[PDB]
Amino acid sequence: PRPRYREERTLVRKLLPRPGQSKQEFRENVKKLRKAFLQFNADVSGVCQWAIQFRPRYGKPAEPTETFWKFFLEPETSLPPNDSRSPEFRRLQAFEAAAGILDDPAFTNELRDSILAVASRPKTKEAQRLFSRLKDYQPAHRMILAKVAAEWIESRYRRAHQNWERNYEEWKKEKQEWEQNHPELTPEIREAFNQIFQQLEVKEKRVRICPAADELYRKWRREYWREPRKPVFRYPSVKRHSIAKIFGENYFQADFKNSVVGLRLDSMPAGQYLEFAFAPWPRNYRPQPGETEISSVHLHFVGTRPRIGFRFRVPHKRSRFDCTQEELDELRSRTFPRKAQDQKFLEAARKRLLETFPGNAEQELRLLAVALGTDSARAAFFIGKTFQQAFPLKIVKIEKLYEQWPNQPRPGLSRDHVGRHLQKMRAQASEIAQKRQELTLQPFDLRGLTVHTARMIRDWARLNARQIIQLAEENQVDLIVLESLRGFRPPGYENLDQEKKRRVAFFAHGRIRRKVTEKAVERGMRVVTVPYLASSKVCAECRKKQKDNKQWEKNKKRGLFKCEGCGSQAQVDENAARVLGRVFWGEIELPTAIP
RNA sequence: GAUGCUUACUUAGUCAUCUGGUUGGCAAACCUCCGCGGACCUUCGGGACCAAUGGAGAGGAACCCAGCCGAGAAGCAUCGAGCGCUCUGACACCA
Ligand SMILES: [Zn+2]
């Protein structure tokens, strides 16, 4: 499908006043830039507003404007595989004709007809004013703006909507099968119990009301009463991260021997730049400016301080596999997106991987099943379905890196550290509330403490990802096995509930998964995420699937355990790694304990 | 490795008992009401978002800005250790 994983890997450095430049002069310059960023965001938001109305609706006959929409979103498929001009240049030509700001054979007759249909539509007041302003812009700015709007609308609407469609079809089939297999006794009787809840304010799927004793209707409601929710569209809000202004070619002048960057604004003419100092390129960082030239510069604001991003090209490594990672993600996202659809997804993924292998996959498939625990973590290694050895990973960060916590708040990147900042926040927002009441949360209230906590969490995730990548590179792996854990929470997470602010301190296992997947696809590897199956409470040697629930947690609290059935003595992490490595193969099944 | 001076510098990459502490606020910044106009979802109750070459008030608790103290980056200057040279913790960066 779409090439989700590109080869860009952009790097962000903070901007600093140049030593020659005066501090007041630097404040005046960051003011000129803040204005340009605001204008760019406004223009992109307006163009997205104009273009969102041409989408083809689900369950309706196709309108004549659809093929222009698909050309605008994905010119690569629309254009022939070979053409001199880049696809984005063709996108700009189509957009100008559509908005009223094409005979080239690169464009098809259907595309021209659809754009003719599109242009013959009424323009709102916002659209007319936006196009009047956009007329004056340079073709480079117009093209960059159109590309950014297209990528934004694609990523933020179309992916989620297509996933929602595929989810909805399976929801139809599953509800039909459910209604036609066990409960044949509810053709209409559901209405009698539904009406009483309808007349009241019960606008929620999971009925947060305790059982009355229809309870079969209750299980039916929490499952198949309402359709899967449709994704809610938004625009590039300047309050959140939103998008980043792009200074393409001939607009930036970055120097590296000494770190100064020549940014150029839209109004500024040729040969004039705004020089700023920035954090110098790391020496140990593997790529260097000499290796690959910088394609463009991406600017965005955190808090009020500007940051810049350098975009360069880094080639990918060809994987021994004859398939892509996007297909493996596609299976789970679209083909099997449900809870019964997990066993089928895993079987299909295993088949697809095995058939794509050049030689004998069973004899030689270098596999590394990594589990992610709290204090510690270990990864198993498989070559041919035969366990070789388990490796420890150093993931506790203190004055030095260790593999385990040495023997009240633990110094270093720990739950205690994060939770102490969460408590500070819980004790500091109160007085803000009272003072605001006296005068008479927001995403600017504790704007330094939260950004610090976010940087801490992402640093922890980066540590985990790089450690895993290094372990995989040590012994030439081709496949990394990961679970679907949500994440861990710090001690102060629960006492700061009801606020999205507390989400800054969630440990984000998914962030680790994304980083690992990106870095693995970087090096010619594949990542498959099995569905959560609680590997910790499953013995690798014999699949006992322990359920004591009282003694197991105590054993995990000291890092050792003992299987109830036979008596294996391995540490919890090694057991879980072996369990995942087996589960990828056919030797262990998913619980599937829904009924 | 130690020591001293200077800097329109940093204290908003993380950790090492650590967004360092403190004093205040004209401009400015930040903050609160609208709201021309656009728009996504919706159980129609409402939720969420952008926005005028757009207009009105207000806090220095929070946001922002400035001063002071503590500290660290370097350019130079002294001595030293090891072997003139090498000489300042660990990690980590696809935002
Ligand atoms: Zn056992």
XYZ file of C-alpha atoms (C1' of nucleotides) and ligand atoms in Angstrom:
691
model
C 0.000 0.000 0.000
C 1.188 3.477 0.985
C 4.874 3.930 1.887
C 4.233 4.790 5.543
C 7.861 4.440 6.631
C 10.028 6.887 4.708
C 13.769 7.500 4.889
C 13.842 11.033 6.337
C 14.802 10.983 10.044
C 14.815 14.757 10.707
C 16.752 16.327 13.597
C 15.663 19.263 15.783
C 17.948 21.836 17.441
C 17.005 24.845 19.562
C 17.635 28.386 18.339
C 20.019 30.674 20.230
C 21.081 34.317 19.952
C 24.193 34.762 17.872
C 27.066 36.208 19.952
C 27.295 39.252 17.690
C 23.548 39.769 17.763
C 22.195 41.793 20.743
C 19.599 40.106 23.052
C 16.985 42.797 22.204
C 17.770 42.272 18.479
C 17.189 38.497 18.972
C 13.802 39.179 20.645
C 12.841 41.421 17.681
C 13.841 38.597 15.243
C 11.894 35.835 17.086
C 8.869 38.202 16.892
C 9.188 38.463 13.069
C 9.338 34.618 12.843
C 6.358 34.040 15.235
C 4.193 36.116 12.849
C 5.205 34.053 9.815
C 4.376 30.785 11.600
C 0.933 32.115 12.539
C 0.237 33.176 8.953
C 1.351 29.814 7.540
C -0.895 27.917 9.949
C -3.867 30.133 9.093
C -3.390 29.559 5.360
C -3.076 25.782 5.741
C -6.167 25.628 7.952
C -8.158 27.613 5.399
C -7.111 25.406 2.489
C -8.028 22.298 4.474
C -11.430 23.844 5.230
C -11.957 24.403 1.508
C -10.852 20.906 0.479
C -12.660 18.827 3.138
C -16.046 19.242 1.413
C -15.156 17.162 -1.674
C -14.704 13.868 0.170
C -16.708 10.844 -1.029
C -19.184 9.858 1.662
C -19.557 6.266 2.824
C -22.565 4.286 1.647
C -23.486 6.778 -1.093
C -23.152 6.707 -4.932
C -19.855 8.289 -6.085
C -20.023 11.989 -7.021
C -18.110 13.330 -10.053
C -15.591 15.126 -7.806
C -14.052 11.979 -6.312
C -11.196 11.305 -8.733
C -9.920 14.861 -8.293
C -9.959 14.231 -4.539
C -7.891 11.074 -4.958
C -5.488 12.895 -7.282
C -5.109 15.665 -4.698
C -4.440 13.233 -1.858
C -2.246 10.639 -3.630
C -0.864 11.819 -6.979
C 1.661 8.958 -7.016
C -0.927 6.297 -7.848
C -2.790 8.657 -10.181
C 0.233 9.683 -12.231
C 1.901 7.128 -14.498
C 4.980 5.537 -12.898
C 7.321 7.604 -15.096
C 7.057 11.363 -15.603
C 9.577 14.193 -15.687
C 7.818 16.495 -13.227
C 7.455 15.525 -9.583
C 3.959 14.466 -8.461
C 3.605 17.492 -6.189
C 4.074 19.864 -9.125
C 1.124 18.126 -10.784
C -0.822 18.433 -7.526
C -0.248 22.190 -7.582
C -1.484 22.414 -11.178
C -4.637 20.476 -10.294
C -5.252 22.562 -7.165
C -4.924 25.885 -8.982
C -7.444 24.795 -11.621
C -9.877 23.421 -9.034
C -9.836 26.512 -6.813
C -10.043 28.777 -9.834
C -6.713 30.483 -9.180
C -4.389 20.612 -17.341
C -4.295 19.381 -20.931
C -0.945 17.720 -20.223
C -1.137 13.971 -21.017
C -0.006 13.245 -17.460
C -3.574 14.241 -16.589
C -6.410 11.961 -17.679
C -9.698 13.000 -19.261
C -11.641 11.895 -16.183
C -9.408 14.055 -13.991
C -9.975 17.113 -16.182
C -13.732 16.522 -16.191
C -13.810 16.143 -12.404
C -11.855 19.373 -11.930
C -14.298 21.076 -14.297
C -17.091 19.806 -12.042
C -15.232 20.978 -8.923
C -14.633 24.515 -10.197
C -18.369 24.814 -10.950
C -19.259 25.013 -7.265
C -20.176 27.963 -5.020
C -17.388 29.495 -2.942
C -18.050 30.576 0.626
C -16.913 33.937 1.979
C -13.887 32.383 3.691
C -12.912 30.536 0.511
C -13.082 33.648 -1.688
C -10.986 35.712 0.732
C -8.470 32.887 1.159
C -8.062 32.479 -2.596
C -7.752 36.244 -3.046
C -4.889 36.247 -0.546
C -3.321 33.090 -2.000
C -3.241 34.600 -5.493
C -0.364 36.877 -4.480
C 1.838 34.115 -3.073
C 4.844 32.711 -4.885
C 4.461 29.346 -6.654
C 6.943 27.813 -4.206
C 4.935 28.933 -1.175
C 1.686 27.836 -2.826
C 3.129 24.412 -3.669
C 4.582 23.857 -0.193
C 1.306 24.967 1.387
C -0.749 22.645 -0.827
C 1.558 19.723 -0.054
C 1.369 20.372 3.690
C -2.426 20.660 3.609
C -2.692 17.456 1.571
C -0.477 15.487 3.949
C -2.346 16.900 6.952
C -5.785 16.016 5.613
C -4.568 12.576 4.524
C -2.962 11.637 7.842
C -5.628 13.168 10.073
C -8.750 12.074 8.178
C -8.369 9.436 5.488
C -6.311 6.823 7.329
C -8.676 6.871 10.306
C -11.767 6.896 8.085
C -10.620 3.921 5.998
C -9.772 2.011 9.165
C -13.236 2.936 10.446
C -14.840 1.590 7.267
C -13.012 -1.729 7.553
C -13.919 -1.896 11.244
C -17.560 -1.131 10.430
C -17.888 -3.941 7.886
C -16.551 -6.469 10.389
C -18.891 -5.001 12.999
C -21.831 -5.663 10.668
C -20.746 -9.244 10.011
C -19.978 -9.964 13.665
C -23.261 -8.545 14.945
C -25.135 -10.521 12.281
C -23.390 -13.762 13.263
C -23.929 -13.051 16.962
C -27.640 -12.339 16.469
C -27.965 -15.482 14.337
C -26.053 -17.929 16.558
C -26.681 -17.760 20.302
C -29.451 -15.165 21.003
C -32.159 -16.022 18.492
C -34.677 -14.684 21.043
C -34.187 -10.950 20.463
C -35.744 -9.832 17.150
C -37.705 -6.975 18.734
C -37.628 -7.476 22.531
C -34.462 -5.357 22.533
C -36.635 -2.298 21.834
C -38.634 -2.587 25.064
C -35.485 -2.449 27.188
C -33.843 0.087 24.860
C -36.664 2.634 25.094
C -36.340 3.209 28.851
C -32.619 3.915 28.484
C -33.285 6.074 25.426
C -35.683 8.372 27.279
C -32.959 9.098 29.862
C -29.494 10.630 29.426
C -27.553 7.418 28.720
C -25.327 8.801 25.945
C -22.608 6.180 26.452
C -21.926 2.651 25.212
C -20.851 1.018 28.482
C -23.888 1.407 30.732
C -22.386 2.693 33.985
C -25.401 1.471 35.945
C -25.275 -1.653 38.077
C -27.330 -4.737 37.050
C -31.048 -4.506 37.790
C -31.399 -8.195 38.680
C -32.450 -7.639 30.690
C -28.843 -8.464 31.389
C -28.416 -10.263 28.083
C -29.586 -7.019 26.532
C -26.981 -5.306 28.718
C -24.153 -7.376 27.232
C -25.687 -6.721 23.808
C -25.773 -2.960 24.389
C -22.182 -2.557 25.538
C -21.171 -4.421 22.382
C -23.500 -3.971 19.403
C -25.943 -1.168 20.274
C -24.054 1.602 18.468
C -21.648 1.625 15.546
C -17.912 2.170 16.006
C -17.403 5.889 16.444
C -16.327 7.960 13.472
C -13.032 9.863 13.723
C -13.426 13.559 14.562
C -11.588 15.921 12.231
C -9.600 18.923 13.450
C -7.403 21.705 12.128
C -3.807 22.776 12.842
C -4.411 24.552 16.149
C -1.554 26.890 17.217
C -2.309 25.932 20.872
C -1.082 22.328 20.272
C 1.962 21.123 18.241
C -0.113 21.259 14.987
C 2.149 21.500 11.865
C 5.613 23.084 11.283
C 6.443 25.809 8.738
C 8.770 24.578 5.990
C 11.603 26.682 4.558
C 12.373 24.734 1.395
C 15.081 25.185 -1.125
C 16.703 28.530 -1.666
C 15.121 29.716 1.605
C 17.558 28.493 4.278
C 21.314 28.985 4.623
C 22.629 26.604 7.299
C 26.293 26.711 8.329
C 27.888 23.912 10.333
C 31.540 24.692 11.156
C 29.845 27.296 13.350
C 26.168 26.728 14.007
C 24.256 29.603 12.384
C 21.210 29.254 10.112
C 20.073 31.762 7.480
C 16.276 31.563 7.578
C 14.339 33.611 5.025
C 10.756 34.802 5.361
C 8.135 34.813 2.626
C 8.215 38.577 2.046
C 12.005 38.876 2.220
C 13.760 39.039 -1.173
C 16.643 36.962 -2.466
C 20.003 37.216 -0.730
C 18.530 38.280 2.629
C 18.302 35.933 5.604
C 17.705 36.001 9.352
C 20.737 34.438 11.012
C 20.331 32.645 14.337
C 22.617 30.475 16.431
C 21.520 26.898 17.112
C 22.708 23.923 19.135
C 25.654 22.382 17.251
C 25.490 19.029 15.523
C 26.341 16.161 17.911
C 29.708 14.567 17.192
C 28.812 11.022 18.266
C 25.566 11.145 16.267
C 26.079 8.712 13.412
C 25.057 10.852 10.394
C 27.013 14.000 9.626
C 26.285 17.036 7.419
C 28.996 15.933 5.002
C 27.362 12.540 4.484
C 23.973 13.821 3.280
C 22.867 17.319 2.317
C 19.976 18.962 4.158
C 16.812 18.845 2.060
C 14.849 21.506 3.957
C 14.423 23.231 7.320
C 11.281 22.805 9.432
C 10.448 25.430 12.064
C 8.013 25.143 14.970
C 7.452 26.697 18.393
C 7.390 25.004 21.788
C 6.188 27.296 24.529
C 7.465 30.543 23.033
C 11.053 29.505 22.154
C 11.624 28.618 18.492
C 13.140 25.347 17.321
C 14.400 24.269 13.905
C 14.446 20.875 12.247
C 16.932 19.711 9.623
C 15.613 17.214 7.076
C 18.118 14.921 5.371
C 18.028 11.644 3.461
C 19.233 8.313 4.860
C 18.950 5.141 2.732
C 17.164 2.077 4.061
C 18.690 -1.397 4.233
C 17.124 -4.168 2.169
C 15.545 -6.832 4.348
C 16.146 -10.548 3.639
C 12.296 -10.739 3.515
C 10.432 -10.262 0.179
C 7.589 -8.238 1.822
C 7.156 -4.757 3.429
C 6.298 -3.607 7.008
C 3.304 -1.599 5.727
C 1.584 -4.836 4.679
C 2.081 -6.328 8.144
C 0.530 -3.228 9.702
C -2.252 -3.322 7.096
C -3.315 -6.829 8.088
C -4.057 -5.756 11.665
C -5.400 -2.303 10.826
C -7.845 -3.300 8.077
C -8.044 -7.038 7.407
C -8.528 -8.201 11.024
C -9.349 -5.231 13.275
C -11.341 -6.952 16.046
C -10.906 -9.092 19.164
C -11.823 -12.367 17.490
C -9.861 -11.136 14.522
C -6.570 -11.560 16.459
C -5.895 -15.284 15.999
C -6.636 -15.011 12.279
C -4.384 -11.952 12.034
C -1.524 -13.778 13.742
C -1.950 -16.873 11.574
C -2.052 -14.781 8.395
C 1.024 -12.810 9.462
C 2.937 -16.003 10.259
C 2.007 -17.536 6.921
C 2.893 -14.373 5.013
C 6.282 -14.177 6.724
C 7.065 -17.862 6.177
C 6.149 -17.905 2.483
C 8.125 -14.722 1.793
C 11.327 -16.148 3.274
C 13.847 -17.108 0.549
C 15.239 -20.316 2.050
C 13.832 -22.532 4.804
C 12.126 -20.216 7.284
C 11.696 -22.880 9.964
C 15.376 -23.850 10.056
C 16.771 -20.294 9.901
C 14.603 -17.395 11.096
C 16.606 -15.236 13.495
C 13.970 -14.173 16.031
C 14.235 -11.966 19.120
C 11.235 -11.876 21.467
C 11.568 -8.911 23.825
C 9.288 -8.372 26.782
C 9.121 -5.016 28.563
C 8.954 -5.100 32.346
C 9.326 -2.428 35.014
C 12.615 -2.718 36.855
C 14.078 -5.236 34.465
C 13.709 -6.726 30.981
C 15.195 -9.611 29.028
C 14.995 -10.753 25.413
C 15.089 -14.318 24.122
C 16.791 -15.356 20.891
C 15.557 -17.949 18.384
C 17.218 -19.116 15.180
C 15.074 -22.039 14.097
C 12.260 -22.338 16.691
C 15.009 -23.506 19.096
C 15.738 -21.298 22.091
C 19.383 -20.256 22.203
C 19.840 -17.828 25.099
C 18.254 -14.906 26.934
C 19.998 -11.529 27.096
C 19.595 -8.876 29.802
C 19.025 -5.231 28.907
C 20.343 -2.262 30.894
C 17.332 0.043 31.266
C 17.602 1.546 34.773
C 19.229 4.961 34.348
C 21.085 6.278 37.408
C 24.488 7.994 37.666
C 25.499 5.046 35.446
C 23.531 2.472 33.421
C 22.690 -0.759 35.271
C 20.517 -3.786 34.538
C 18.731 -3.802 37.909
C 17.892 -1.346 40.677
C 20.675 -1.305 43.298
C 19.683 -1.757 46.924
C 13.096 6.488 49.546
C 12.487 7.945 46.046
C 14.835 6.174 43.630
C 17.384 8.554 42.152
C 17.407 8.472 38.385
C 14.767 8.051 35.716
C 12.246 6.170 37.829
C 8.545 6.084 38.627
C 9.302 8.045 41.791
C 10.974 10.873 39.879
C 8.052 11.213 37.483
C 5.483 10.879 40.270
C 7.095 13.565 42.411
C 6.528 16.040 39.588
C 2.948 14.835 39.210
C 2.341 15.584 42.873
C 3.954 19.006 42.601
C 1.445 19.717 39.830
C -1.493 18.435 41.886
C -0.456 20.690 44.773
C 0.210 23.716 42.535
C -2.873 23.864 40.287
C -5.196 24.257 43.275
C -4.103 27.792 44.157
C -4.302 28.670 40.460
C -7.943 27.589 40.566
C -8.703 29.677 43.664
C -6.928 32.758 42.296
C -8.844 32.486 39.039
C -12.069 32.224 41.016
C -11.040 35.339 42.947
C -10.381 37.127 39.665
C -13.805 36.157 38.345
C -7.020 23.784 33.494
C -5.671 25.232 30.251
C -2.867 23.943 27.998
C -0.471 26.577 29.286
C -0.792 26.416 33.083
C 2.253 24.487 34.334
C 3.983 24.872 31.002
C 7.548 24.189 32.153
C 6.960 21.301 34.534
C 4.833 19.423 31.990
C 7.312 19.905 29.134
C 10.073 18.664 31.449
C 8.035 15.578 32.360
C 7.307 14.878 28.688
C 11.002 15.127 27.830
C 11.769 12.721 30.679
C 9.258 10.137 29.438
C 10.422 10.357 25.841
C 14.065 10.020 26.977
C 13.115 6.803 28.772
C 11.417 5.514 25.614
C 14.485 6.424 23.519
C 16.708 4.513 25.940
C 14.555 1.401 25.621
C 14.399 1.587 21.825
C 18.141 2.012 21.315
C 18.946 -0.773 23.782
C 16.639 -3.137 21.883
C 18.104 -2.118 18.522
C 21.634 -2.747 19.773
C 20.718 -6.179 21.126
C 19.117 -7.057 17.782
C 22.170 -5.886 15.827
C 24.499 -7.859 18.111
C 23.328 -11.249 16.772
C 21.897 -10.455 13.306
C 18.146 -10.702 13.958
C 15.472 -10.545 11.245
C 12.338 -10.405 13.414
C 11.522 -8.685 16.714
C 8.493 -9.844 18.716
C 6.591 -7.325 20.863
C 3.333 -7.311 22.814
C 0.597 -4.666 22.988
C 0.989 -3.331 26.522
C -0.618 0.054 27.143
C 2.045 1.261 29.527
C 2.797 1.842 33.179
C 1.602 4.619 35.455
C 3.507 6.587 38.116
C 2.320 6.788 41.746
C 0.685 10.200 41.300
C -1.170 9.302 38.100
C -4.424 8.308 39.802
C -4.714 11.298 42.165
C -4.616 13.715 39.196
C -7.525 12.121 37.326
C -10.188 13.808 35.147
C -7.455 15.904 33.451
C -5.655 15.273 30.174
C -2.686 17.029 31.811
C -1.752 13.856 33.714
C -1.229 12.047 30.381
C 2.175 13.755 30.130
C 3.459 11.253 32.714
C 2.163 8.004 31.187
C 5.067 5.744 30.310
C 3.735 5.061 26.795
C 4.703 1.513 25.783
C 3.282 2.391 22.369
C 5.923 5.082 21.947
C 8.573 2.399 22.438
C 6.843 0.241 19.833
C 6.761 3.067 17.272
C 10.411 3.984 17.858
C 11.524 0.342 17.648
C 9.538 -0.201 14.452
C 10.989 2.897 12.793
C 14.562 2.024 13.745
C 14.093 -1.622 12.703
C 12.642 -0.791 9.289
C 15.667 1.508 9.054
C 18.058 -1.470 9.192
C 16.288 -4.064 7.048
C 14.150 -5.774 9.688
C 10.483 -6.502 10.360
C 8.361 -5.933 13.456
C 5.206 -7.931 14.253
C 3.079 -6.971 17.269
C 1.223 -9.976 18.669
C -2.011 -9.162 20.596
C -1.820 -8.941 24.447
C -1.991 -12.514 25.884
C -0.506 -12.004 29.415
C 2.815 -13.862 28.749
C 3.927 -13.279 32.405
C 1.271 -15.768 33.708
C 2.199 -18.555 31.180
C 5.031 -21.145 31.570
C 7.301 -21.411 28.472
C 8.212 -25.149 28.903
C 4.585 -26.386 29.356
C 1.664 -23.967 28.772
C 0.140 -24.240 32.322
C -1.271 -20.651 32.209
C -1.063 -20.089 35.993
C -4.018 -18.320 37.619
C -3.094 -18.181 41.326
C -3.098 -14.330 41.149
C -1.956 -14.142 44.805
C 1.458 -15.802 44.808
C 2.466 -14.879 41.248
C 2.595 -11.142 41.961
C 4.682 -11.744 45.077
C 7.118 -13.854 43.058
C 7.336 -11.166 40.368
C 8.098 -8.664 43.135
C 11.480 -10.379 43.612
C 12.193 -11.275 39.975
C 11.912 -15.059 40.406
C 8.921 -17.369 40.041
C 8.034 -21.102 40.042
C 5.546 -22.764 37.610
C 2.661 -24.470 39.487
C 2.577 -27.545 37.154
C 6.226 -28.615 36.709
C 8.496 -26.187 38.626
C 10.548 -24.076 36.138
C 12.850 -21.582 37.967
C 13.569 -18.900 35.285
C 13.113 -15.161 35.936
C 9.807 -13.609 34.914
C 11.228 -11.663 31.970
C 13.003 -14.686 30.485
C 9.792 -16.701 30.806
C 7.763 -14.001 29.063
C 10.328 -13.686 26.268
C 10.251 -17.441 25.660
C 6.443 -17.355 25.770
C 6.241 -14.654 23.098
C 8.791 -16.433 20.914
C 6.703 -19.597 21.130
C 3.436 -17.720 20.521
C 4.729 -16.309 17.245
C 5.150 -19.923 16.140
C 2.308 -22.408 16.352
C 3.364 -23.865 19.692
C 1.179 -21.638 21.919
C -2.308 -20.279 21.233
C -4.079 -17.070 22.170
C -6.497 -17.211 25.138
C -9.619 -16.312 23.105
C -11.544 -16.386 26.398
C -14.413 -14.139 25.279
C -17.276 -16.618 25.799
C 43.107 16.764 37.770
C 43.282 21.623 40.210
C 42.934 27.388 39.855
C 41.686 32.459 37.973
C 39.611 36.197 34.513
C 36.214 37.450 30.463
C 31.755 36.676 27.594
C 24.917 40.994 24.272
C 25.993 32.976 26.772
C 22.832 28.750 29.254
C 20.014 27.262 33.483
C 13.064 24.523 28.595
C 17.469 17.329 26.079
C 17.465 13.438 30.621
C 19.939 11.392 35.014
C 23.654 11.818 38.906
C 19.608 13.722 46.769
C 18.397 18.957 40.286
C 12.375 22.400 34.784
C 18.250 25.752 40.621
C 16.719 30.058 44.395
C 14.706 34.963 44.808
C 12.654 39.924 43.810
C 9.257 42.590 41.250
C 6.264 44.480 36.485
C 5.767 51.139 31.787
C 6.083 49.597 27.102
C 5.719 44.713 25.013
C 4.583 39.711 25.831
C 1.127 36.417 28.021
C -4.136 36.155 29.749
C -10.202 36.822 29.519
C -14.660 38.173 26.698
C -16.743 38.467 21.943
C -17.329 37.148 16.980
C -17.620 38.810 10.991
C -17.102 34.345 8.454
C -15.744 28.509 7.696
C -16.221 23.845 9.156
C -16.006 17.752 11.918
C -18.999 14.676 14.985
C -23.688 14.164 17.137
C -27.844 9.752 20.819
C -29.927 16.670 18.350
C -28.911 17.755 24.567
C -24.496 19.253 22.786
C -18.913 18.126 22.137
C -14.398 19.648 19.328
C -11.622 23.275 15.829
C -9.962 27.259 12.750
C -10.605 32.234 12.116
C -11.202 38.675 10.550
C -5.216 44.063 6.968
C -11.667 42.748 13.674
C -12.949 44.925 18.064
C -13.114 45.406 24.118
C -10.804 44.495 29.611
C -7.550 42.324 32.910
C -3.040 39.198 36.483
C 1.802 39.490 37.875
C -0.726 32.767 41.563
C -0.664 30.351 37.069
C 1.335 32.175 31.467
C 4.857 35.963 29.937
C 8.943 39.689 30.658
C 12.927 41.903 33.358
C 16.518 42.354 37.679
C 19.582 39.854 41.570
C 22.028 35.291 43.729
C 23.691 30.215 43.101
C 25.590 27.231 39.131
C 27.802 25.535 33.901
C 29.765 26.133 28.279
C 33.680 28.086 25.982
C 38.475 31.670 24.838
C 42.728 32.666 27.202
C 46.286 32.441 31.562
C 49.043 29.028 35.892
C 50.398 24.385 37.906
C 50.072 19.156 37.743
C 49.159 13.731 36.630
C 50.058 9.913 33.083
C 52.783 8.877 28.600
C 55.878 17.869 23.981
C 51.397 15.165 23.987
C 46.988 13.092 26.175
C 44.414 15.723 29.408
C 36.514 17.131 32.177
C 30.677 11.762 34.292
C 26.751 8.544 32.003
C 22.847 8.272 28.435
C 20.042 10.016 24.421
C 17.713 12.700 20.115
C 11.899 10.564 13.401
C 10.057 17.089 15.933
Zn 5.292 -25.293 33.528
